[PDB]
Design a binder for these strands. Sequence first.
RNA 1: UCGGGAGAAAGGUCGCCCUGAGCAAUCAGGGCCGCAGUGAAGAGGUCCAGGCGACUGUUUAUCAAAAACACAGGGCUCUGC
RNA 2: UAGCUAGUUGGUAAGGUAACGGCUUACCAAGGCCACGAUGGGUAGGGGUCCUGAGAGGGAGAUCCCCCACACUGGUACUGAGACACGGACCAGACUCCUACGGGAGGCAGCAGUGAGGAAUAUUGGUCAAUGGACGCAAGUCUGAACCAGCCAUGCCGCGUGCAGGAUGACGGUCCGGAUUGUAAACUGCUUUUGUACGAGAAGAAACACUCCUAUAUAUAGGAGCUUGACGGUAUCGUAAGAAUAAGGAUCGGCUAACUCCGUGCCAGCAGCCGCGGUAAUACGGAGGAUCCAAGCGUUAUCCGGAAUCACUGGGUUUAAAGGGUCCGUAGGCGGUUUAGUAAGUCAGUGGUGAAAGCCCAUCGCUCAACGGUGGAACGGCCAUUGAUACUGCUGAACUUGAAUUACUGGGAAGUAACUAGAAUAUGUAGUGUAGCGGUGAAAUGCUUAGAUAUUACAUGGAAUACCAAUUGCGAAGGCAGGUUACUACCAGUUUAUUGACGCUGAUGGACGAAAGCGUGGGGAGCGAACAGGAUUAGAUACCCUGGUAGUCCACGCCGUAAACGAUGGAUACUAGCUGUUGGGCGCAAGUUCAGUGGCUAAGCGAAAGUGAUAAGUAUCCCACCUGGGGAGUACG
RNA 3: UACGUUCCCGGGCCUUGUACACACCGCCCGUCAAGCCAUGGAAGCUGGGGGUGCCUGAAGUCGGUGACCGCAAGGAGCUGCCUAGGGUAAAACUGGUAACUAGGGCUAAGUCGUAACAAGGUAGCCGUACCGGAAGGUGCGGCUGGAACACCUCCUUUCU
Lengths: 131, 121
Amino acid sequence: YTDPIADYLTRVRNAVAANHKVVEIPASNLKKEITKILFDQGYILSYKFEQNTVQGSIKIALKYDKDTKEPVIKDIQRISKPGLRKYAGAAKLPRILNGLGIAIVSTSKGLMTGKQAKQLNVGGEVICYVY
Amino acid sequence: PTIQQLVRTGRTQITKKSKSVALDSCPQRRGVCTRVYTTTPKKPNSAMRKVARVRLTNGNEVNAYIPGEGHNLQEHSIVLVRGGRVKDLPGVRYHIVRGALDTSGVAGRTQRRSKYGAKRP
RNA sequence: UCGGGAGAAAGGUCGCCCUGAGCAAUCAGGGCCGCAGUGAAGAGGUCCAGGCGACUGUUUAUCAAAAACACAGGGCUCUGC
RNA sequence: UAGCUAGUUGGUAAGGUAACGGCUUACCAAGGCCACGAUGGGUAGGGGUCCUGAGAGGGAGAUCCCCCACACUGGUACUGAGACACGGACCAGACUCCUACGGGAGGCAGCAGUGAGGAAUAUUGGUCAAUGGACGCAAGUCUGAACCAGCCAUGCCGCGUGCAGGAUGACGGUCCGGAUUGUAAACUGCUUUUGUACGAGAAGAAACACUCCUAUAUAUAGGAGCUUGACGGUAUCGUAAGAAUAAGGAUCGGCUAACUCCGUGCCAGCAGCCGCGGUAAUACGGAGGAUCCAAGCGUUAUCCGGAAUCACUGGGUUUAAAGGGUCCGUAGGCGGUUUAGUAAGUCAGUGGUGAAAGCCCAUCGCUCAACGGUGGAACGGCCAUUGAUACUGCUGAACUUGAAUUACUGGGAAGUAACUAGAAUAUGUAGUGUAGCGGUGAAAUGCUUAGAUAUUACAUGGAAUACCAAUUGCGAAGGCAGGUUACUACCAGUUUAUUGACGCUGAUGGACGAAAGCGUGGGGAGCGAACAGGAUUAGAUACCCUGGUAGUCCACGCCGUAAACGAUGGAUACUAGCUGUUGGGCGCAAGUUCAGUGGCUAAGCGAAAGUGAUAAGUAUCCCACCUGGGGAGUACG
RNA sequence: UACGUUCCCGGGCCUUGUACACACCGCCCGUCAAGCCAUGGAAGCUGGGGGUGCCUGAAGUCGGUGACCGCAAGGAGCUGCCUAGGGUAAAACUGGUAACUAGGGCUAAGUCGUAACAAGGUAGCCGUACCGGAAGGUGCGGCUGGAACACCUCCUUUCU
């Protein structure tokens, strides 16, 4: 591969576009952290860490409304790329969706959100953003 | 395209070639005329436009257009070229200031007096 | 024509004595003499452009050495022993 | 612009300079820089800053401040702490001047000025009264630094050219008596900001030096008056006639705010683009009215924005300009999972710095503003140090999913070399036989009574392989087709076994690369460029007909071009189906799963045509290419 | 007299191709002839800076000699290195100009032909070779970015 994070986001985006229910992505520490952040923020219904593989799987259940489905994930994209890494201290964090979207920022403490890191006054590297 | 390609060779910015080149980037230029004659437009206009071959002080031979009606413009006269081409005569890319050192102004003009060099009656 | 053109063109030292570095040679510093130091003799003048002949070569012994002849190369044609 | 450097690179000893050092010399070695751009050429003083822009950026380096270089053009040294010295010296060169002809004196890139050049930029002014500088104990002297004054609407800011009432008055443009300028005007009351006259009238001045008492110590401190203004009788205030002393420029078809008439009739002319004028012009000239700005208004010249029109923010490559002809691969760019260590990138804190001035914010003084004072922010940057370890980089270890190797089943017009077969065409020999054969839309040229065309048998030679045979298959592409053998290569599936990230892309570069073309030596049946006749046509250097050279073929080579096309670069991962077919596996059949090859179509993309799981769908990495048309794939190297 | 619509002319409908839209009585291409404009080549002519190799080399700092001045120092006088300037030789870069010559853009739309746009009247185009007043023609290979037509000779299977 070239970017497992980009693949992890692309699988979710394609499944949302195709109106699926579950995804069976491969697993890693960074993907597990991103899944935990997304479930805490409320963009996915549930996630299961499936064993019995040399690497392990992540089964994520996508969330839609009970009427007029309107998937809550409208645009999930990357900011840092393996061809251009973009870092920023705790003053240049993005303004994704005018404060209505989340921006995952890998900080020196751990993986946090753009709004959860500005309170701690730590910088880090912006990984991705979700509307 | 690729960030690596841009790092290797960036975007090429062009120079934006100028419009009036044979006047040495000055607002006005003095000159002496050698042949004052008349030419035709391209199409579909039909007229007899008055032009003059002017040799500027920097050694440049240009074709200037005489605005308005009424002038002397003999075979040797000190004129002041300012610039501004016309879309009718192919080659004429300059204008002559009316009211300059030796060129005449206009008589009977009352509306556009700032141009054509006309005093206030 | 990659071989040439080319010794292209255009320049510098050369005598005698001493000292030192040196492989004999030579070199580096000083000093002296004369108008002149490869001091006599022997040893390419050079460049630019055109015609002819690719080139070396041969020719009217005894008025013509050439743009003439020859030349390597190219072609046509004859020849089955 | 692909090589540059010869004291050049390093070292050993001296001479040295304030000081280390090839700075210089003597000796030894051949080093040093270069695609991350040496060298060479063009241009240019650098920065704080100014303009523009939402920002990222872009364009310049006036005036204020800091650094560097220079003083007619060049070189050298002295004095001096400090100079290789603007108003010092010496020498040489070019100008100007004096001369008794022997020889001498000069340098406004200092202020004010002259000539020339240019579209264009000013007084041969006043004072040291403040601040600074040099000398002096001081008084004091000098200061074209500096402070003032004159000229230029050059730019910024502020004010004025009056304020209230007053009818639809003359006069103009326009319509067929009305509307328009228009409370606009005449006229009636009021103010002098400004302008003129007169009377008062500043701050900028704090001090220095000399005589007086105090203390301590030869240092500091207080108080006194005759003191010290170029601006300058300048700013400012008061008094008295008088609306008196003061408004122009551009535009009016659309973009863009504002319309009517008269004159000219493609003329005169207008024009930033579209474009208007050939006799009813809202576009030309004039008149009226209207709009904008305003002591200014327009044009030109140079910049930024609009321009997402070089796009990191923030574009594309099927058909509009754009995928290299295709692979291999160097430098380079990117990196499957887990784990241990460091903390280089990244993040946070502290200290230093990031001059002053300038922009912004806040607050004070000039009657406001411009301007000036104070404060903060900013100066996105750099150095040292202390922490965090989530992500990237480095080191170590582990794993198999990626990748590669091995084993078994197979797969093909996949290559190179050598043999071989038939049909057909051409020619030759022999037999039979007589007047045609061939060709066209019709004819003719052509072969034929020297026996053609036709037929039979044999022989010779060259090229290509009917049926199979096709949206088949293989190859990186070009391309590969009668049959056989030898020497190779590659691919697919699957029970294996094995190594363990060994991967993707890839600028320079290498290899291959249709046909045509070029060189050398053979071969040459058919076809056939050029060419020769016949025919058509007004002409026919063509289409048509009859011949025909190179070529097409073979063995070594050379060039490296195509509509070299899927007009779609290579990888990996996801996202609906239906329907054939090729080679495998599992299947007693149904059918299922990989690897390739076609058609329909959903969502999604696209300007549309269309594409659509073999994407032109959603993402990430790398390479190439595009920036209006022509000139032009042209000129030069 | 009329068998009939295959041809000649005109008109209607459907589909198809188009580079036409004042609409094929359209559009458009090339050579030659006459002017204007800018840019290349060329026998030569004429300059401008900077570099290198030699010769000569003012002043000046620094050395040698110094038989002459001085009591010592030191100096006069010769002389060496360095270096501005001058002369010379061959090249490199670059500017102007030149008899003649090749091609490009416009002008009134002159002369000759009709090459492309419909199946453009011989389908077009690309690479290449030859030829011709010119557009162009032909040979070999490749593409559809071309129109009109556009399903088939064998019917069915045994281990050879």
